[PDB]
Design a protein around this ligand. Structure first.
Ligand SMILES: CCCCCCCCCCCCCCCCCC(=O)OC[C@H](COP(=O)([O-])OCC(O)COP(=O)([O-])OC[C@@H](COC(=O)CCCCCCCCCCCCCCCCC)OC(=O)CCCCCCCCCCCCCCCCC)OC(=O)CCCCCCCCCCCCCCCCC
Ligand SMILES: CCCCCCCCCCCCCCCCCC(=O)OC[C@H](COP(=O)(O)OCCN)OC(=O)CCCCCCCCCCCCCCCCC
Ligand SMILES: NC(=O)C1=CN([C@@H]2O[C@H](COP(=O)(O)OP(=O)(O)OC[C@H]3O[C@@H](n4cnc5c(N)ncnc54)[C@H](OP(=O)(O)O)[C@@H]3O)[C@@H](O)[C@H]2O)C=CC1
Ligand code: SF4
Ligand code: SF4
Ligand SMILES: [Zn+2]
Lengths: 338, 169, 49, 44, 51, 198, 172, 118, 53, 442, 98
C-alpha cells in the first residue's frame, strides 16, 4: 500500500489543498478544530454524525470548517452498517477518527462500543478502500489494559484493533486538552461558579497532568500528515511541563485571582454515589476514577518533539481563557475604563 | 416601408467654449506674453505700435481686447482693467439679467404670491374637504367609475383571452 | 393550478376535454420542495456526490 | 386648467348637489361651544 | 446659589473670546412651550403658477 | 437658448490674475456653466462666492474627483478640437470638480481643478460650506486626495484598520482581502482572497 | 483646549471631584478621554523632511504610550508584551522609512492617528487590529509553533525552500 | 410577467431550444451564468455546461429578454427555499427538469405575452 | 480698551491681561489654534495633572 | 415668565472645574441593531441626562462599492444598481440614470413622454415613499397601528409595479431609449383610479389620529427648527427645503423640468416654521397632489368625446371595438404623432428582420455606444434632489459615474439640529429626515 | 454680554435659544493663517532663564541634526524585513513552568 500524500498547504479557504478528508466523532471538542485545520487550506471535509439534537451548535458549526462546496455533513449515520462506512470514505484519502467514550458514560458495554467497535469498523473500511493513504486514530495518554477506568482500557483495546486492521494507521494519545470549550478549564470555572464556595476534590490531588492547548493538537495532525515516516507510529502529545492536580488548581487560582478552596470528600463515598446515581457532564464516575490516575507522557512511544511541534506553556496558554472570570478586587481608577 | 429617417439627424450635442485673457493684464503685458514684443523695447512708441499692428493682423482682435474666443455670447465689449466704464456696463447687464431671469419663471418666483398668499388650512376630518380641487378630483373619479360601470353593463358580456395548445404545434 | 390560484389567468387544468395547457410527451409531474430530504439537488462535484 | 374652477378638464360638472351633500360635512365648527358646554355640565 | 457657581466666569469668557470666531465649547438644552404646542393650528402655503 | 442666460464673468473680473475658461453644453441643463479654476486660488474663490451679493445665496450640491491618468478616447479619435474640455483630461494626474447652485441667478456652476502633484494636495473649503465635510472626506478616502485645513479628516465609508483608495483605476474591484470567521480564534479575521472569475 | 486631546478632557476622579481637593488633575495620555472625539482637523502642512520626521516620532510616542491600555482592553496581552508590540510597529515604520514627500507623510500621520483612535475606542476587532502588532519572523506567544520546515530545510537557501514548496495548487 | 425560478425550455419535439449563443451570459448584470459549449456528435451546437449561481442572481430577467429562442425563462415558482448553500448551485439537470415540470404554465404565459404585440 | 477693565492695547497687539501680569501659554494656544492639535504635547501642566491623578 | 437662560446652557472656561464636565458622559452605541437606527447606522452618541451633546455617525456599514461596479459594467448592466440606491423609491433612480444616458446621447425618449408612463410612475413611487416615511416616523414616535395601513395601501402600488415588469420592488423598468409599450394596458389605469379613490379614504384615516393629536403636536412642533441659511449651508433640498421656506421644485423649474411635468397643473407646498410638523403636513399634501397628477396624466391619455348621431344627438357606441370597454387608450398620442415609428416597431422584430437581429445581438452582447462627454442630470426624487454626474470616454462602459444623494446631506445636517434635544427628540428627528442608507452608503 | 451677543432675554424667546447659540456658523479663517511659516505651539522663550529652566524647551539640536541628515540622505532604498521563520528570541512563553 502507498502512504504518500501530496498536498499544497500554501493556500487559503478558497484554494485547493489536495486533501479529501473524513472525520469521525467531530461533534465533541476536537472536531471543529481538527476540521478547521484541514479545511482552512482548501480541503474537502466530511462529518458523519448521529447527534441527539440536530439543532445543537455542536453540529451546525461544523459547516464553518470549510467553505461552500467543501464541507459536507452526513446525518443519521448508522455506526453499525458497513455500507455507510464505505460511503463515508469513498473519495477520501485521509481519515481521522475522533470517536470515543463520552465523559457522562459509565457503561462498560457502551465504552467498548465507542472505543473498540466503531474504531474497528472505520479501520476495516479504510483497509478495503485502496485510495486511503493516512488514517489518524485518537487515543488517550493513560490508556492501559489494566486501567480501572473503562475508557482507558477500551481505548487500549481500540489501539490494538486499529493497528491490527490498518497497520499504516497513526495513533495519537493526547495527555489532556484545554481550550474555550473543554472539560478542564471550563469545568473548573463552572464548578466554582455553581459551588460558589469551593471546588470539590475527592483525593489528595497528587495525580499528574501534562496539559496541551487545542491549537497545538491541530498543528500536530498537520505535521503528521506532512511526515511520511509517521505512518505506523504511536505519538504521545503533552505540554512542556508536568504538574500535579494541586499545582494546576493553584496556578488557575493565581492566574485569575480567585482564592482557592478545595473541599474534600472521601473517595469511596464519591465512587458509590456516582455508581448508583444518574451521571451527566458535571457528575460522573469518570472524573472520580481519573482523578487518581496520571495522564502524562510515559516515554515508551514517540513524543510531540518528533512531530516538530513546540507546545506553549500552560501558564502562558491558559491565561486568555480566564480573562472574563478575573477577580474584581481593589483596582486603580484607570481600570474602570474598559 | 419608410426606413431612411429612422435615425435622428439633428441631436442636442452642441458645446460652446469661451476663453478670456486675465482682466488685470495690461496691453504691454499682453504684447510681451504673446511673442510680439520683448522686455527691452518697452516704453517706446514705435515698438508698441509695431506690436499692436502685428497683433491686429495675426490675431483677429485689438491688443486691448482680452476676449480670446467667445462662442457662448459672441460679445464685442471686453471687460478690461483700463476701461472702468466697462465694469459699470457689466454691472448694469448683470442686474438686468437678474431681474429678467427671475421675471421668466412660471412657478418659482411670483411677487403676487408674495403679496397675496394662498394657504391650505386643516379644519375637518376630511383632508380633501378643505380644498375644492381635491373634492373635484374625488367627484371626477366617481364619475369615471360610474361611466365605466354603465358602459360595461350595456354590452352584457366580456371578451377574454383563452389558452390554445394548437398554438404550440 | 398555481397560476389559477395566484390570479395570473382564469384558466384551470381539466382532466378530460379541451385544455388550455400543453401536454407534451416529455413533461414531468410537479414535485414539492425536496430540500432537507435525501432527494435534494447535488452539484456534480460536491462531496455529497 | 384642472386646478381652478370651471375648468374644461374637470368632468363632473353637472348637478351633483346630492352627492356633494352626502360626501362632505354640512355644518361648520364654531369655537367655544364644546368648551362652554362641557365646563358648565361638569360644574353642575 | 448652587447654580450661581457656573455663572461666575461667564462674563469674562464672553468678553475675552469672540463667540463666532474662537470655537468655544459649551452645552445647552432646548425648551418647548407646551401651551403653544397645544393651540397651534396646522396650515401650509400653497404655491401655484404665475396666473 | 429659449431662456435667459449669462456667464459668471464677474468672478474673473474680481480675480484679475486668473485666466478664464468656461463651457456651456446641450448635454447639461441650459443654466449650467462649467469653468476651470487653478488650485492655488480655490479657497479665496470660495470665500468670494460665499459672501458676494448675487452669489451669497448659493449652496454646494456635489463634490468629487476624476482619475484621468488612464483616460483614453475609445471612438471618434479624429473629432477632437482644442476647445473640448476633455482635452484637459490628458497628461493630468488628477481632476476635482465642485457643483453649486445659485438661487438668485437660478444657475448651476461647476468648477474644475487640475491636480498635477504626486501627493494630490489641495485646500479644503469645509470651513466655508458645511456640505464639504462629508463630501470631501469621501473623496479623500476614495481617491487619496490630501485635503489641507480640513475640519475632519477621518474615514467616512471605508472599513476599520485599512488603508486603501478603491476608486483609483489601478485598484481591482475585488480588493485584496476577504473576511472570514476563524475557529482557532473565535472571531473574524481578514485573509488574502482567492475569487471566482467569469 | 476644544480638542479630544485637550488637557481638560479627562475622566473625573469622583462624582464630586475632578481630583483630590486643593488641586485638579486627570489622565488623558495613557487612557482614553472623557468625551468622544467629534472632529479631527488636518495636520498643519510640513514644508520639509524635518517637520515630517518630528510628526512621525510624536505619533510613534503616542502609540507607545497607548499600547498597555489597548492590550488590556483587547485581551491580547498573552500574544505579546507591550515592548514586543512597540518593536513590531517600529518595524512597520522602518519599512516606511524611504518616504520623502512631506505631504504624503502628513496624510500617513493622519491615517495613523485615526487607526489608533479606532483601536482605543473598541471600534475595530482585536483579531483585525493585531495585524499591526504581530511579529514579522517570530511565532505568537499565546500558542505553540511548528519548526518542521526549519529542520528539513536546514541550510538550504530561500530559493530551494520556495522551490520545494510550490506557488500553486497541484491537483489542477 | 412575474420573475421567479429559472428554467430551460424545449421545442414541442423535445429538442433543446438553447443553441449556446452566450448572449444570456453577457447580459447578466450579476455574472451568475456560466456556459461552456462543444459540438454535439450529431453536429448541433449545444452547451456542455450551463449553470446559474442563484445566490448571485438578482432575478432581473435580463437573460430571458436576451435569449433569441426563448430557451432560458424565469418561471412562476417562488417556493425555492433551500437548506444548503449547495442546493442553490443550479446545473443543467436542475434547469432542464424545472422546464420539464413548469412547461404548461410558462407556455400559457408566453403565449399571452407573444399575442400582446400581435 | 472700552469694556475691558485695566487691559491695555499696545502696538501690533490688543493685549489679553492687566499690565505686569503673566501671559498664559495655554490661552495663547487656544486663541491662535481654535481646534487644531497636531499632537498631544506634554507640557509641565499636563505632566503635573498626570502625577496628581 | 422670568428668565431661565442660565439654567439652559453651560459654557466651558480654561481650567475651570465648575465650568468643565463634572460627570462621566454616557457614550452609547446607537448601533446597527437598534429599532430607531434603521439598518446600518452606528452613531456614537454622548448623552448627559438623556440630552444629546456629541455625535459621531459611523457610516459605511452598507457601503458596497456600487460606483466602481457601475464603472466595471456596460451601461445597461449598472442601471439595476440604481434600484438599490434609495430602495424605497425605485423608478426615480432609474429615471435619473436614463436621463443622464439620454443627455450623453443627445436625444429624448419620446415613446415614454407620449405615453405619460414616467410621470405616472414617478408620482406612484412618490406616494410609496411618503407612505413609508410617514408610517415609520409615526412608529418611531409611538403610534403603532398606522404602519399597518400604509403598508397595505403600498401593497397595491407594488402590484401595479408587478403588472408592468414582474417585480415588486426592483423594477429595472426604465430604459435609455426603449419603452415596453405592450406592458401598459387600459385595464391597468382603471385600477389605478380605483386605488386613488380608496387612497383618499386611507389617507384621511391616517389623518385623524395624528394631525390634531395633542401628543403628536407636542412631539413634533418646534422640534428641529432651522431657517433658510442652514438650509443653504447644509445643501438641503426637497421636503426639507420646502419646510425651511424655500420654493425649490425641479419639476416646476423652467430650465430643469422633465417628463411632462411642465405642462400639468399641480400645487407645491412650503412651510413657514421649518420644523417636523411642517414636514409631516407637506408629505401628506404631496401624496394628495401626486394623486391629482396621476389623474391628470390618465386624463391626458384618455378618449372622452364620442361620435353622436346627426339627428337626436344620441351617442353611437361601438359593439366590437376595444374602445367600448374603456375610455383610456394609452397609445393614442403616440400613434397619432409618431405613426411611422409606431408602425415599424409593431411589425419588425429580431425574428423576421436582419437589421433588428443585429441590433439585438449588439445590444445584449456589448451594449450601446455612448459618445464621449460629461453630463450632470438631476431629478426631484421624493427624498430631495437626486443627481448623476457621469463622464464617458466613448466606449460601451461609463468612465466615471458619481451619484448625488440628498439623504447623505440630511444625515449630515442631523447633528446640527439634534444637539440639545432629548433622546426621544433625536429618534423623532431621525424619523423626520427621510434617510435611506442604501442611498447614503451606496 | 449675552444681550450684546443677541441671546434671548425673555421666557417666551428662550424657545428659540438654539437659533442664536448654535445655528450661527463660525466665520472661516483668513488665508494669512494658512500662509504662516511656523505652526508650533507657543511657549515662553527661556533665553534669559537659568540652565535648569532651559531643559524644558524645544530641542533645536534635534531639528538641526535632522536637517543635516536629510540633506545628506535625499534618496534611500526601501528597507525590507525578512519574513523567513526563526526561533523566538524570548523563549519564556514555551519554556516557563509557572
Ligand atoms: C359613543 C358616544 C358618541 C357617539 C357618536 C359619535 C359621533 O358621531 O361623533 C361625532 C359627533 C359630532 O361632533 P363633531 O364631530 O365634533 O362635530 C364637528 C363639527 O364641525 C361641528 O362642530 P361643533 O363644535 O359646532 O359641534 C356641534 C356641537 C353641538 O354643541 C352644542 O350645540 C352646544 C350647546 C351648548 C352651548 C353652550 C351653552 C351651555 C349651556 C346649555 O357638538 C358638540 O358639542 C358635540 C358633543 C361634545 C362632547 C359631549 C360629550 C357628552 C358626554 O360628536 C359626538 O358625538 C361627541 C359626543 C356626544 C355625546 C352626546 C351628547 C349629547
Ligand atoms: C344629571 C342631572 C339629572 O338629570 O339628575 C336627575 C334629576 C332628577 O333626580 P333628583 O334631582 O334626584 O330628584 C329626585 C328624583 N330622582 O333631574 C332633574 O332634577 C332635572 C333637572 C336637573 C338640573 C340640575 C342638573 C345638574
Ligand atoms: N479532550 C481531551 O481531554 C482528550 C480526549 N481524548 C480522546 O480524543 C477523542 C476526541 O476528543 P473529544 O472531542 O474531546 O471527546 P468527546 O467526548 O467530547 O467527543 C466524543 C465523540 O464521539 C462520539 N461518540 C461517543 N460515543 C459514541 C458512540 N457510542 N457511538 C458513536 N459516536 C459516539 C460523540 O458524538 P455524540 O455523543 O454526539 O454521538 C463525539 O462526536 C475522544 O476519543 C477522547 O476520549 C484523549 C485524550 C484527551
Ligand atoms: S441566451 Fe438563450 S440561446 Fe443564448 S447561450 Fe443563453 S440560453 Fe442559450
Ligand atoms: S435574472 Fe438577471 S441576474 Fe438573474 S441570471 Fe438572469 S440576467 Fe442574471
Ligand atoms: Zn481486556
Amino acid at each position: 500500500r502507498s502512504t504518500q500524500l501530496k498536498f499544497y498547504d500554501g493556500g487559503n479557504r478558497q484554494s485547493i489543498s489536495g486533501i479529501r478528508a473524513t472525520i469521525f466523532g467531530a461533534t465533541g471538542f476536537m472536531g471543529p478544530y481538527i476540521g478547521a485545520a484541514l479545511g482552512y487550506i482548501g480541503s474537502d471535509v466530511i462529518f458523519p454524525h448521529n447527534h441527539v439534537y440536530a439543532y445543537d451548535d455542536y453540529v451546525k458549526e461544523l459547516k464553518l470548517c470549510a467553505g461552500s462546496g467543501q464541507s459536507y455533513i452526513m446525518r443519521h449515520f448508522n455506526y453499525d452498517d458497513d455500507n455507510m462506512y464505505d460511503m463515508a470514505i469513498k473519495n477520501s484519502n485521509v481519515v481521522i477518527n475522533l470517536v470515543g467514550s463520552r465523559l457522562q458514560n459509565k457503561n462498560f458495554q457502551k465504552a467498548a462500543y465507542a472505543n473498540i467497535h466503531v474504531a474497528k469498523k472505520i479501520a476495516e473500511a479504510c483497509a478495503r478502500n485502496p485510495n486511503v493513504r493516512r488514517l489518524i486514530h485518537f487515543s488517550a495518554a493513560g490508556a492501559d489494559t489494566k486501567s480501572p477506568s473503562p475508557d482507558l482500557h477500551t481505548k487500549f483495546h481500540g489501539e490494538e484493533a486499529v493497528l491490527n486492521a490498518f497497520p499504516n494507521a497513526t495513533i495519537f494519545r493526547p495527555c489532556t486538552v484545554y481550550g474555550m470549550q473543554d472539560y478542564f478549564i471550563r469545568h473548573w470555572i463552572k464548578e466554582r461558579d455553581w459551588w460558589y464556595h469551593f471546588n470539590i476534590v475527592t483525593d489528595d490531588c497528587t495525580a499528574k497532568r501534562q496539559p496541551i492547548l487545542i491549537n497545538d493538537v491541530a498543528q500536530c495532525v498537520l505535521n503528521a500528515l506532512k511526515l511520511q515516516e509517521s505512518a505506523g507510529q504511536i505519538y504521545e502529545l503533552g505540554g512542556p511541563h508536568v504538574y500535579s492536580r494541586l499545582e494546576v488548581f493553584e496556578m488557575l487560582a493565581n492566574l485569575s485571582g480567585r482564592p482557592p478552596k478545595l473541599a474534600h470528600i472521601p473517595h469511596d463515598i464519591a465512587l458509590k454515589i456516582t455508581q448508583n446515581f444518574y451521571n451527566w457532564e458535571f457528575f460522573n464516575m469518570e472524573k472520580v476514577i481519573k482523578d487518581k490516575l496520571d495522564l502524562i507522557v510515559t516515554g515508551k512511544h514517540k513524543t510531540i518533539s518528533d512531530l516538530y511541534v513546540q507546545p506553549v506553556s500552560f501558564p502562558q496558554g491558559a491565561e486568555q481563557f480566564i480573562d472574563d472570570v478575573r477577580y474584581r478586587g481593589v483596582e486603580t481608577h484607570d481600570n474602570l475604563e474598559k | 416601408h419608410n426606413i431612411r429617417y429612422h435615425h435622428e439627424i439633428h441631436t442636442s450635442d452642441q458645446t460652446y467654449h469661451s476663453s478670456y485673457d486675465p482682466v488685470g493684464e495690461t496691453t504691454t503685458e499682453r504684447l510681451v506674453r504673446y511673442g510680439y514684443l520683448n522686455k527691452d523695447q518697452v516704453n517706446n512708441a514705435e515698438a508698441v505700435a509695431a506690436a499692436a499692428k502685428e497683433f491686429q493682423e495675426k490675431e483677429k482682435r485689438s491688443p486691448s481686447n482680452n476676449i480670446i474666443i467667445d462662442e457662448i455670447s459672441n460679445s464685442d465689449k471686453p471687460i478690461t482693467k483700463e476701461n472702468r466704464e466697462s465694469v459699470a456696463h457689466h454691472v448694469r447687464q448683470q442686474f438686468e439679467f437678474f431681474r429678467e431671469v427671475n421675471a421668466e419663471e412660471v412657478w418659482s418666483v411670483s411677487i403676487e404670491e408674495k403679496y397675496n398668499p394662498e394657504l391650505y388650512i386643516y379644519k375637518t376630518y376630511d383632508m380633501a374637504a378643505d380644498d375644492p380641487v381635491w373634492r373635484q378630483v374625488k367627484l371626477d373619479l366617481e364619475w369615471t367609475f360610474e361611466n365605466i360601470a354603465e358602459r360595461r353593463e350595456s354590452l352584457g358580456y366580456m371578451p377574454t383571452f383563452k389558452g390554445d395548445p394548437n398554438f404550440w404545434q | 393550478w398555481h397560476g389559477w390560484l395566484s390570479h395570473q389567468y382564469d384558466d384551470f387544468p381539466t382532466r378530460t376535454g379541451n385544455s388550455a395547457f400543453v401536454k407534451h410527451h416529455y413533461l414531468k409531474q410537479h414535485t414539492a420542495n425536496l430540500s432537507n430530504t435525501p432527494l435534494n439537488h447535488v452539484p456534480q462535484g460536491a462531496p455529497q456526490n | 386648467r384642472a386646478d381652478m374652477a370651471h375648468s374644461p378638464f374637470h368632468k363632473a360638472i353637472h348637478d351633483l348637489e346630492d352627492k356633494r351633500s352626502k360626501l362632505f360635512p354640512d355644518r361648520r365648527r364654531i369655537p367655544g361651544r364644546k368648551a362652554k358646554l362641557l365646563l358648565a355640565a361638569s360644574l353642575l | 446659589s448652587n447654580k450661581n457657581y457656573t455663572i461666575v466666569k461667564q462674563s469674562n469668557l464672553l468678553t475675552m473670546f469672540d463667540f463666532f470666531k474662537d470655537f468655544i465649547n459649551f452645552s445647552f438644552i432646548r425648551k418647548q412651550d407646551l401651551n403653544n404646542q397645544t393651540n397651534f393650528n396646522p396650515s401650509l402655503r400653497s404655491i401655484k403658477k404665475k396666473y | 437658448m429659449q431662456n435667459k442666460y449669462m456667464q459668471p464673468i464677474q468672478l474673473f473680473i474680481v480675480f484679475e490674475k486668473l485666466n478664464s475658461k468656461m463651457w456651456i453644453s446641450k448635454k447639461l441643463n441650459s443654466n449650467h456653466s462649467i469653468a476651470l479654476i487653478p488650485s492655488n486660488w480655490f479657497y479665496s474663490i470660495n470665500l468670494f462666492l460665499k459672501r458676494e451679493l448675487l452669489f451669497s445665496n448659493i449652496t454646494l450640491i456635489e463634490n468629487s474627483a476624476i482619475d484621468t491618468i488612464s483616460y483614453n478616447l475609445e471612438t471618434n479619435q479624429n473629432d477632437l478640437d482644442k476647445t473640448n474640455i476633455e482635452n484637459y483630461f490628458f497628461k493630468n494626474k488628477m481632476l476635482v470638480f465642485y457643483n453649486y447652485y445659485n438661487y438668485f441667478l437660478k444657475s448651476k456652476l461647476t468648477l474644475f481643478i487640475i491636480l498635477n502633484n504626486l501627493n494630490k494636495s489641495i485646500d479644503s473649503i469645509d470651513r466655508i460650506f458645511a456640505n464639504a465635510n462629508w463630501l470631501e472626506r469621501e473623496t479623500s478616502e476614495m481617491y487619496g486626495i490630501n485635503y489641507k485645513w480640513k475640519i475632519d479628516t477621518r474615514k467616512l465609508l471605508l472599513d476599520y484598520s485599512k488603508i486603501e483608495n478603491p476608486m483609483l483605476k489601478e485598484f481591482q474591484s475585488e480588493g485584496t482581502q476577504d473576511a472570514f470567521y476563524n475557529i482557532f480564534e473565535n472571531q473574524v479575521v481578514v485573509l488574502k482572497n482567492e475569487t471566482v472569475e467569469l | 483646549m476644544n480638542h479630544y486631546w485637550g488637557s481638560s478632557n479627562t475622566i473625573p476622579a469622583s462624582s464630586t471631584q475632578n481630583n483630590n481637593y486643593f488641586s485638579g488633575g486627570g489622565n488623558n495620555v495613557t487612557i482614553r478621554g472623557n468625551e468622544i472625539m467629534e472632529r479631527l482637523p488636518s495636520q498643519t502642512p510640513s514644508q520639509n523632511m524635518v517637520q515630517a520626521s518630528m510628526k512621525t516620532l510624536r505619533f510613534y510616542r503616542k502609540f507607545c504610550r497607548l499600547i498597555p491600555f489597548i492590550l488590556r482592553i483587547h485581551n491580547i496581552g498573552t500574544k505579546f508584551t507591550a515592548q514586543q508590540a512597540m518593536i513590531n510597529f517600529g518595524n512597520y515604520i522602518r519599512e516606511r522609512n524611504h518616504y520623502r514627500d512631506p505631504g504624503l507623510i502628513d496624510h500617513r500621520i493622519q491615517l495613523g492617528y485615526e487607526l489608533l483612535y479606532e483601536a482605543e475606542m473598541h471600534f475595530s476587532q482585536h483579531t483585525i487590529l493585531m495585524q499591526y502588532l504581530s511579529p514579522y519572523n517570530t511565532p505568537l506567544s499565546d500558542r505553540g509553533y511548528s519548526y518542521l520546515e526549519k529542520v528539513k530545510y536546514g541550510n538550504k537557501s530561500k530559493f530551494l525552500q520556495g522551490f520545494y514548496k510550490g506557488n500553486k495548487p497541484t491537483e489542477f | 410577467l412575474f420573475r421567479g425560478e429559472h428554467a430551460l425550455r424545449r421545442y414541442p419535439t423535445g429538442e433543446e431550444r438553447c443553441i449556446a449563443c452566450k448572449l444570456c451570459q453577457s447580459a447578466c448584470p450579476a455574472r451568475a451564468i456560466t456556459i461552456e459549449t462543444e459540438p454535439r456528435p450529431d453536429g448541433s451546437r449545444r452547451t456542455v455546461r450551463y449553470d446559474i449561481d442563484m445566490t448571485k442572481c438578482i432575478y432581473c430577467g435580463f437573460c430571458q429578454e436576451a435569449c433569441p429562442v426563448d430557451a432560458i425563462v424565469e418561471g412562476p415558482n417562488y417556493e425555492q427555499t433551500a437548506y444548503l448553500h449547495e442546493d442553490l448551485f443550479y446545473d443543467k439537470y436542475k434547469l432542464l427538469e424545472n422546464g420539464d415540470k413548469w412547461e404548461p404554465q410558462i407556455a400559457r404565459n408566453i403565449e399571452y405575452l407573444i399575442n400582446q404585440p400581435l | 480698551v472700552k469694556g475691558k477693565g485695566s487691559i491695555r492695547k499696545g502696538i501690533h497687539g490688543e493685549g489679553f491681561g492687566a499690565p505686569s501680569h503673566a501671559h498664559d501659554a495655554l490661552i495663547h494656544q487656544i486663541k491662535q489654534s481654535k481646534d487644531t492639535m497636531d499632537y498631544q504635547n506634554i507640557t509641565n501642566e499636563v505632566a503635573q495633572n498626570f502625577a496628581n491623578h | 415668565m422670568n428668565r431661565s437662560i442660565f439654567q439652559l446652557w453651560k459654557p466651558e472656561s480654561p481650567r475651570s472645574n465648575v465650568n468643565s464636565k463634572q460627570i462621566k458622559t454616557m457614550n452609547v452605541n446607537f448601533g446597527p441593531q437598534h429599532p430607531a437606527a434603521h439598518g446600518v447606522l452606528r452613531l456614537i452618541l454622548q448623552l448627559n441626562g438623556e440630552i444629546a451633546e456629541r455625535f459621531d455617525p459611523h457610516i459605511g456599514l452598507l457601503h458596497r462599492g456600487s460606483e466602481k461596479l457601475i464603472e466595471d459594467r456596460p451601461y445597461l448592466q449598472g442601471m439595476p444598481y440604481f434600484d438599490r440606491f434609495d430602495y424605497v423609491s425605485m423608478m426615480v433612480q432609474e429615471h435619473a440614470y436614463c436621463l443622464g444616458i439620454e443627455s450623453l446621447l443627445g436625444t429624448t425618449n419620446y415613446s415614454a413622454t407620449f405615453t405619460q408612463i414616467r410621470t405616472m410612475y414617478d408620482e406612484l413611487t412618490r406616494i410609496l415613499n411618503h407612505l413609508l416615511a410617514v408610517a415609520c416616523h409615526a412608529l418611531d414616535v409611538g403610534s403603532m397601528s398606522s404602519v399597518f395601513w400604509a403598508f397595505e395601501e403600498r401593497e397595491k402600488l407594488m402590484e401595479f409595479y408587478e403588472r408592468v415588469c414582474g417585480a415588486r420592488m426592483h423594477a429595472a423598468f426604465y430604459r435609455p431609449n426603449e419603452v415596453n409599450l405592450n406592458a401598459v394596458s387600459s385595464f391597468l389605469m382603471e385600477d389605478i383610479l380605483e386605488f386613488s379613490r380608496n387612497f383618499f379614504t386611507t389617507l384621511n384615516e391616517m389623518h385623524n389620529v395624528l394631525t390634531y393629536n395633542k401628543i403628536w403636536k407636542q412631539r413634533l412642533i418646534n422640534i428641529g427648527t432651522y431657517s433658510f441659511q442652514t438650509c443653504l449651508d447644509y445643501g438641503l433640498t426637497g421636503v426639507m427645503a420646502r419646510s425651511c421656506g424655500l420654493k425649490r421644485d425641479l419639476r416646476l423649474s423652467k430650465t430643469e423640468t422633465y417628463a411632462n411635468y411642465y405642462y400639468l397643473n399641480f400645487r407645491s407646498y412650503t412651510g413657514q416654521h421649518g420644523d417636523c410638523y411642517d414636514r409631516f403636513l407637506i408629505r401628506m399634501n404631496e401624496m394628495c397632489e401626486s394623486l391629482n397628477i396621476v389623474n391628470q396624466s390618465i386624463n391626458k391619455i384618455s378618449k372622452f368625446n364620442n361620435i353622436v348621431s346627426i339627428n337626436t344627438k344620441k351617442n353611437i357606441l361601438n359593439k366590437e371595438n376595444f374602445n367600448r370597454q374603456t375610455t383610456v387608450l394609452p397609445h393614442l398620442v403616440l400613434s397619432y404623432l409618431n405613426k411611422n415609428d409606431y408602425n415599424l416597431k409593431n411589425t419588425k422584430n429580431d425574428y423576421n428582420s436582419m437589421e433588428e437581429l443585429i441590433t439585438h445581438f449588439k445590444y445584449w452582447s456589448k451594449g450601446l455606444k455612448v459618445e464621449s462627454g460629461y453630463t450632470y442630470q438631476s431629478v426631484e426624487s421624493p427624498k430631495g434632489e437626486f443627481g448623476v454626474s457621469m463622464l464617458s470616454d466613448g466606449s460601451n462602459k461609463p468612465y466615471k459615474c458619481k451619484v448625488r444623494s440628498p439623504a447623505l446631506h440630511h444625515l449630515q445636517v442631523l447633528p446640527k439640529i439634534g444637539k440639545g434635544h432629548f433622546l426621544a427628540d433625536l429618534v423623532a428627528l431621525v424619523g423626520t429626515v427621510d434617510i435611506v442608507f442604501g442611498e447614503i452608503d451606496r | 454680554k449675552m444681550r450684546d451677543l443677541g441671546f434671548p432675554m425673555e421666557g417666551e424667546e428662550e424657545e428659540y435659544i438654539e437659533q442664536r447659540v448654535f445655528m450661527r456658523e463660525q466665520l472661516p479663517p483668513l488665508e494669512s493663517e494658512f500662509w504662516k511659516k511656523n505652526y508650533d505651539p507657543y511657549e515662553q522663550d527661556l533665553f534669559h532663564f537659568p540652565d535648569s529652566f532651559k531643559a524644558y524647551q524645544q530641542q533645536y539640536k534635534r531639528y538641526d541634526e535632522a536637517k543635516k541628515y536629510f540633506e545628506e540622505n535625499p534618496n534611500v532604498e526601501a528597507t525590507i524585513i525578512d519574513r523567513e521563520f526563526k526561533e523566538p528570541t524570548n523563549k519564556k512563553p514555551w519554556t516557563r513552568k509557572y
